[PDB]
Amino acid sequence: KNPKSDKFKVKRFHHIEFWCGDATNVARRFSWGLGMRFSAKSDLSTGNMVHASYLLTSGDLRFLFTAPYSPSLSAGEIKPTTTASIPSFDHGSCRSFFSSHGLGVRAVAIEVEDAESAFSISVANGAIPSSPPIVLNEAVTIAEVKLYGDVVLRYVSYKAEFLPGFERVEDASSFPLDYGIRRLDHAVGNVPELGPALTYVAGFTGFHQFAEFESGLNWAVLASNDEMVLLPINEPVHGTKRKSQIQTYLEHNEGAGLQHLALMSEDIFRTLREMRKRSSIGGFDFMPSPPPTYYQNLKKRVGDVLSDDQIKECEELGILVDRDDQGTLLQIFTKPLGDRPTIFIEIIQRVGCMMYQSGGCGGFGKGNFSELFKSIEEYEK
C-alpha cells in the first residue's frame, strides 16, 4: 500500500555532506576508494574564508566533504557579508559535531520543488528547524530541519553548477575515476527508539512506511511518493546474547546518527573487483565474506535469477543476495569508513521491478539476517 502522502513535492536524493576535520584527506581517500571524480570546490582558492568543501561525484551520486578553517580568517564577517558558500555552516556546530561523533554525515540532502515551501510545511508539521531557507544568487534555495541526532534533512530546490560559489575543478586535477557507482539508493539512521523517530519524521514529511517482504534490532523504512527517497531507521534490541550492534553504534557515536549509505552500482561485480583491488592501498575494506554454505544455499533461493557463473562470481567477491516477492537484491558492506565502528557503506544492485525500475526493488536484505545465521551454523558442521 502506497498512500502517496508526501506533504510537499520530493524529487531525488541530491547529495550527502560529511563533516570532517580535514576535508582534503577524507575526500582524496574516498575518491580513490570508491572511484569518484573531484568535480567542484569551495575553499580559500574560491574566496571562501569560512569552510573548505570538496565535491565528489560518480554518476548521480554526490559526496560533499566539508571542514572549518580557523575562525580568525573570517572574524570580520557577519552573515550578510559571509564568504561561506553554505550559509547554514557554523564553525562551532561543525567542530562540536566532529568532536562528538567523529567523521560522519551531517546532511542528507534531497531535491524538492520548492525548498522554502518544504521547510514551512515541515516545521508547521512538527519539524525542528535547523537553518532557515536562504536563496543563493537568486538561483538555488537551501533549508535544513533536524532529522535525528545531529543529522539534518536538507532541502534543495533550483529555479532552473552544484551550488553558487562552487567552482568546477581543473580537468588536470579531476581524474575520471569510475567503478560503476551511479546513485544513492538509501540512507539509514540508528536511534535509541524507533517509534518516536518514525512518528517525528513521517509526521513532518508525510513519508509513508515502505512494505517489507533475534538479530538485535528492529527497523522500518520511510519513503517518498514514488519511493525513490528511502530512509530506513534502526533501533537496538536489548538483552540478546550478542550485544546489539545498534547499541554499540550509539555508544561509540555518542548517540543517534547516520549508520550506512547504500550506493547503487550498474555492475556490482565490476564495482567490487575495483574496490577490493584498492582495499589495502588506501581504499575501503569489506566485511568478512559469508561461508561457502551460504553460496551453496544460493542455488535453491535465486537459481532462477543468477547463473552458476554469476553465483560463483558472488562467492569470489563476498556479495550477499536477497529476494522480495518483486525483485532480487545484491549487496555487500564495507568495514567502518573511519576510526569509530559507526558509519559504513553498502554497495547494492537491484534486479527486477521493471515498469524504469521502481524504488526499493527486492527490499533491503532482511532475509539475509536469518540466512547468514543458518549458513554459519551449517558451515560449521
187 lies in the binding site for Co ion (CB under 5 A): no
Q: What grid cell was written down for 92?
A: 562551532
Which residue among 65, 179, 200, 364 contacts ligand T5I (CB under 6 A)? 364
In 3-state terms, what secondary structure has residue 220? strand
> Whole-angstrom Cα distance, residue 301 to residue 315?
15
Grid coordinates representing 296? 551453496
- 346: contact with Co ion by CB under 5 A: yes
Residue with cell 537551501: 142
Residue among 326, 290, 327, 287 nearest 311 (CA): 290
The nearer residue to Co ion, 42 or 259, going by C-beta atoms, is 259
Q: Which of the listed partners (ligand T5I, its own copies, Co ion, none) does 114 bind, with a CB threshold of 5 to 8 Å by partner kind? A: none
d(CA 200, CA 196): 6
* The one-letter amino acid at 206: G
Which residues form the interface with its own copies (CB under 8 A)?
Answer: 20-26, 28-33, 38, 43-44, 52, 67, 69-70, 72-73, 95, 98-100, 102-103, 172-175, 177, 251-254, 280-283, 285, 337-341
CB of 219 to ligand T5I, least distance (A): 4
Q: For residues 149 and 336, which CB has a smaller minimum distance to ligand T5I in the complex?
A: 336
Residues whose CB falls within 8 Å of the CB of residue 96, separated by 6 or more in sequence, listed in order:
none
Distance from C-alpha of 301 to C-alpha of 237, rounded to nearest angstrom: 28
Please tell me whether residue 265 binds ligand T5I under the rule CB under 6 A.
no
C-alpha neighbours within 13 Å on the C-beta side of residue 4: 3
Return the one option of its own copies, Co ion, ligand T5I, none that residue 245 interacts with (CB less than 5 to 8 A, by type). Answer: ligand T5I
How many Å apart are CA 2 and CA 343, to the nearest integer?
30
Is residue 346 marked as binding? yes
Spell out the residues 6+ positions from residue 124 whose beta carbon is closer than 8 angstroms to its own: none
* Shortest spacing between CB 17 and its own copies, in angstroms: 15
Which x/- pattern over 261-280 shows residues binding Co ion (rule: CB under 5 A)? -x------------------
Q: Is 15 annotated as a binding residue?
A: no
Cβ 230 to Co ion, closest distance in Å?
9
The reply to whether 186 sits in an annotated binding site is yes
- Write the interaction track for ligand T5I spanning residues 307-336; mark x where CB under 6 A is met and - where it is not: -------------x------------x---
Query: For ligand T5I, which stretch binds (CB under 6 A), given 18-26, 85-93, 96-104, 366-374?
Result: 366-374
Site for ligand T5I in 170-199 (CB under 6 A): 186, 188
Count the Cβ atoms, other than its own, within 10 Å of residue 229.
26
Name which of residues 189 to 248 contact ligand T5I (CB under 6 A): 219, 232, 234, 245
Angle at 190 between CA 184 and CA 192, to 5 degrees: 160
3-state secondary structure of 281: helix
Stretch touching ligand T5I by CB under 6 A, among 93-101, 278-286, 311-319, 363-371: 363-371
Amino acid at 332: I
What end-to-end distance do the CA atoms of the chain give, in Å? 42
Residues near ligand T5I (CB under 6 A) are 186, 188, 219, 232, 234, 245, 260, 262, 287, 320, 333, 346, 364-365, 368-369, 372
Q: Residues annotated as binding site for Fe cation?
A: 186, 260, 346
